[PDB]
Amino acid sequence: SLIQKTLTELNQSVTDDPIRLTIHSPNIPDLSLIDLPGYILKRKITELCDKYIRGPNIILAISAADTDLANSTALQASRRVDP
């Protein structure tokens, strides 16, 4: 909850700098994921996402079952930068 009140107050405050986090739990395996804004002004958001996805990072796309697979932007831009 206190992490919620914190990072959300940075979410309302809003540079383009990405906030760092470190979380320690015995259940959790150490990882290194970064979470940029998801596709929905919009042309700006898309722009950040392309820049980040371009470089050879391991990109994690998600898709909701209801959506057509072709239709979803997530898998689609992952196809755009990784054929």
Binding site: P29, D30, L31, S32, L33, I34, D35, L36, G38, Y39, I40, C49, Y52, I53, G55, P56, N57, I58, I59, L60, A61, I62, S63, A64, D66, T67, S72, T73, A74, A77, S78
Partner: protein, 45 residues
């Protein structure tokens, strides 16, 4: 399988360091980027 998580950890701290070097530290190690459509995005978060 303790040696297995670790190489990763040793690498993750290093990614952190290249990340923090400086201005010209254009250079870095990859990581996972997470992208999702709005239904998708709620799903992802």
């Amino acid at each position: 399988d303790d040696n297995m998580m670790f190489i990763t950890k040793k690498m993750i701290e290093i990614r952190n360091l290249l990340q923090k070097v400086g201005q010209g530290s254009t250079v870095t190690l990859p990581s996972i980027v997470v992208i999702g459509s709005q239904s998708s995005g709620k799903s992802s978060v």
